[PDB]
Amino acid sequence: VCCGYKLCHPC
């Protein structure tokens, strides 16, 4: 997770 909110991968 490259942001905090649990959705951002694959980044």
Asked if residue 10 has a cis previous peptide bond (ω within 30° of 0), the answer is yes
User: Rounded to an integer, what distance in angstroms lies between the CA atom of residue 11 and that of residue 1?
Assistant: 8
User: Rounded to an integer, what distance in angstroms lies between the CA atom of residue 2 and that of residue 11?
Assistant: 7
Q: Which residue has the tokens 């959705």?
A: 7
User: Rounded to an integer, what distance in angstroms lies between the CA atom of residue 9 and that of residue 1?
Assistant: 5
Tokens describing residue 6: 């649990």
CB of 11 closer than 8 Å to CB of 2: yes
CB of 2 closer than 8 Å to CB of 8: yes
Query: How far does the chain reach from its first CA to its final CA, in angstroms?
Result: 8
Experimental method: NMR
